[PDB]
């Protein structure tokens, strides 16, 4: 598959970003697209050469290396540059295959960047008696920005069956051009399964924050990229 | 140069069929249909300049002279939820796709044996669950979402509220939800 | 058959010559200037009714050039056999003294698309007003090409289109005079 | 010093405007055609052994085929439409003169397009026998010309008529030459 780095990036107005892409082995063409507020076309490379370019300032620029991986580089970043930047490879004029994207956020400053707090809520006794099913709920609150990935782990192994996480998150203070965020997810297993003290249930959130090299202006903890989690053993 | 999709969004119940449409204003070397999941991963469904192609429950038709494409989803499925793009390889421009704005699709489960109930959990936190897919949830209260216990062929809707339950859900909850404690 | 549109591209090594053109019933609609990277219409007024995005041609040429290279190795470096041109000189319209006219040098059925062409007036080179087409495709995969020289018809003057091509032993010299 | 040539030609063949359309994609290495996509066949065919690997590779790229098979509508018919007004419906009126070279010459120059009918009349009556023509000459600048000649000794008091019919005139053009 097509790969991209990095997955997320926060940047302050006026800084510069470098995004990486590798095409599918065999593919010799690379396409960059910007998806903001439907995708817009940025650049096309084949065999190391810029073949074509969309309607973007010279601030946006890139290149492709001899092994066909490429770099997109943006320079005098603006708030409007905030977007999912997608990379694709293909044989010319054939099917396009897309990578997972670089989710790039450009802010005026970082002072409003907060990691989440994470907590887990054990199933009610009322549910189990009623349905023979147990729903754990995880809550991730107070984060900004919306750059999070939530996963459940049961006995140290990732789980998708029986899981729902919110399509996309809600603002802690709805009327506010800068609010913090919340997100919930449920995990449902059977009655007997939760009622078994050996079983370990972990909810976790991967927060994508500031990097080690970001300038920090504030007194509180530096809101770096990290993992906040909560756990709960099955109560018999 | 212009790529119109219809409709702009759509809500189905699992098992329903529909047609997504795409209209375009110029000759197009090829046309491609994508599914984009919430994480942002685009998946190609069809490379289709002309004719009709089937792949399972999905099929597509492109009529090149008339400049439209239809995307057929038979027997819809919760996993089909996401955004559907037609994108277009304009015949006069090499190496570029032009995208429409997408059609957002949401497919909810067909809850055959509803058991609407509201529960309170310990570490706040109320859980409205097991209600059928026609229930709207009023907007801390999250929107509904399906979960699939894939291996016992069981799906259920739920929502969450925090900061007692009986207040939180208000919002037309079924005429006989199960409310303990 | 009524009409034929041909998108024709060629690449010649080791000269590193590339051409991309559109042909309608044997006439050029346009071609791409590789150097300046722009669409050049055979008649200026075609640029009103139509556009062509030149970047697409440059891409095709890159691929053509890579294909040629691979194809050269596959044929164990079989080089092209020179096919020498046929040359006719002829006028725009029927000649009359003191009334302006054009000499047409028509060069046809030759291959590798490389020629050197000079007009001579009374044995000596002329280059005032001269113009030329690019290389044009033929169905037997050889080429045509046109050279033009505006001139004032006179009774003294002898004209020559001199065509050099590797398929010939000596430059071909084609006589024209007003009789 | 040896030359190596690659040619790529996309030929759109139109029968009665856009009712029947054939697409011909041809690769030519040093004057020898090696592989083609003919919309009439629906896949790539090697013409020579040289082109055999290209036909097999390209026939296994499903996207490419699907695309080529629709090109008859997306590409051929499309370009026809873009170019109709200044190619297919281009009309330039022939300039017709008649002079004795005995032998009467009817010159018909500067016309477009290439279909023309040239006839001679000795005293308002046809003369199909004794008619010598150059054939249709393509000038390279979207105009054609032709010279049609009649072998007759002119007896004075006679009339000769060069009649020319051409899509650029609703009724035909006639130039006369007397005495």
């Amino acid at each position: 598959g097509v790969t991209q780095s990095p997955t997320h990036l926060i940047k302050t107005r006026g800084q510069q970003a470098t995004l990486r892409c590798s095409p599918i082995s065999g593919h010799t063409s690379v396409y960059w697209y910007q998806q903001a507020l439907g995708l817009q076309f940025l650049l096309w490379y084949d065999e190391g050469e810029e073949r074509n370019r969309g309607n973007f300032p010279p601030r946006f620029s890139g290149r492709q290396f001899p092994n066909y991986s490429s770099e997109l580089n943006v320079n005098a970043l603006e708030l409007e540059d905030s977007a999912l930047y997608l990379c694709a490879s293909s044989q010319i004029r054939e099917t396009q295959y897309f990578g997972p994207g670089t989710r790039l956020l450009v802010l005026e400053d970082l002072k409003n960047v907060f990691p989440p707090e994470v907590a887990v809520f054990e199933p009610s006794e009322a549910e189990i008696s009623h349905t023979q099913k147990a729903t754990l709920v995880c809550l991730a609150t107070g984060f900004y920005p919306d750059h999070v990935e939530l996963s459940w782990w049961v006995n140290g192994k990732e789980v998708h069956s029986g899981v729902c996480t919110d399509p996309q998150p809600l603002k802690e203070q709805p009327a506010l051009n800068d609010s913090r965020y919340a997100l919930s997810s449920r995990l449902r297993v059977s009655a007997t399964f939760w009622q078994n003290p050996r079983n370990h249930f972990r909810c976790q959130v991967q927060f994508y924050g500031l990097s080690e090299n970001d300038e920090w202006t504030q007194d509180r903890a530096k809101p770096v990229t990290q993992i906040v989690s909560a756990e709960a053993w099955g109560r018999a | 140069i212009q790529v119109e999709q219809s409709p702009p969004d759509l809500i189905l119940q699992e098992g329903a069929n529909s047609t997504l449409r795409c209209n375009f204003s110029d000759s197009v070397n090829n046309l491609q249909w994508f599914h984009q999941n919430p994480w942002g991963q685009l998946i190609n469904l069809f490379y289709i300049p002309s004719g009709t192609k089937q792949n399972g429950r999905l099929s597509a038709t492109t009529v090149a002279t008339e400049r439209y494409s239809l995307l057929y989803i038979s027997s819809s499925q919760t996993t089909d939820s996401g955004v559907y793009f037609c994108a277009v390889d304009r015949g006069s421009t090499l190496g570029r796709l032009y995208f429409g704005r997408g059609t957002q699709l949401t497919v909810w489960p067909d809850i055959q044996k509803p058991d609407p109930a509201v529960y309170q959990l310990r570490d706040s936190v109320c859980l409205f669950t097991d209600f059928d897919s026609q229930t709207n949830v009023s907007q801390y209260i999250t929107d509904k979402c399906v979960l699939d216990m894939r291996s016992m062929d069981f799906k259920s809707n739920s929502a969450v509220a925090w900061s007692a339950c009986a207040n939180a859900f208000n919002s037309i909850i079924p005429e006989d939800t199960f409310f303990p404690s | 058959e009524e009409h034929v549109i041909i998108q024709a591209e060629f690449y010649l090594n080791p000269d590193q010559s590339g051409e991309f053109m559109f042909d309608f019933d044997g006439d050029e609609i346009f071609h791409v200037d590789m150097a300046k990277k722009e669409t050049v219409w055979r008649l200026e007024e075609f640029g009103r009714f139509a556009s062509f995005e030149a970047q697409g041609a440059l891409a095709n040429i890159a691929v053509d050039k890579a294909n040629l290279e691979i194809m050269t190795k596959r044929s164990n470096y079989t080089p092209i056999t020179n096919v020498p041109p046929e040359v006719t000189v002829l006028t725009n319209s029927p000649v009359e003294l003191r009334e302006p006219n054009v000499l047409i040098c028509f060069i046809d059925k030759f291959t590798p698309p490389v020629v050197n062409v000079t007009w001579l007036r009374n044995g000596k080179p002329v280059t005032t007003g001269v113009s030329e087409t690019v290389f044009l495709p033929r169905e037997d995969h050889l080429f045509r090409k046109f050279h033009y020289l505006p001139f004032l018809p006179s009774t003294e003057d002898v004209y020559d289109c001199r065509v050099e091509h590797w398929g010939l032993d000596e430059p071909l010299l084609k006589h024209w005079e007003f009789d | 010093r040896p030359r190596f040539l690659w040619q790529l030609k996309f030929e759109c063949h139109f029968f009665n405007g856009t009712e029947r359309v054939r697409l011909l994609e041809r690769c030519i290495y040093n004057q020898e055609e090696s592989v083609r996509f003919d919309s009439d066949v629906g896949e790539y065919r090697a013409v020579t052994e040289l082109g055999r690997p290209d036909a097999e590779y390209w026939n296994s790229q499903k996207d490419l085929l699907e695309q080529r098979r629709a090109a008859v509508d997306t590409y051929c018919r499309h370009n026809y439409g873009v170019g109709e007004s200044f190619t297919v419906q281009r009309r330039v009126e022939p300039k017709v003169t008649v002079y004795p070279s005995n032998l009467l010459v009817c010159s018909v120059s500067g016309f477009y397009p290439g279909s023309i009918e040239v006839r001679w009349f000795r005293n308002g009556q046809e003369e199909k026998a004794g008619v010598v023509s150059t054939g249709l000459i393509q000038n390279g600048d979207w105009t054609f010309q032709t010279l049609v000649m009649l072998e007759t000794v002119p007896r004075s008091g006679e009339v000769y008529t060069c009649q020319v019919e051409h899509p650029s005139v609703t009724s035909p053009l006639t130039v006369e030459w007397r005495a």
Partner: peptide, 15 residues
Amino acid sequence: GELIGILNAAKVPAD
């Protein structure tokens, strides 16, 4: 004015 369409040159198989 209106745009002329192009067909892409297919890459011959490598090696």
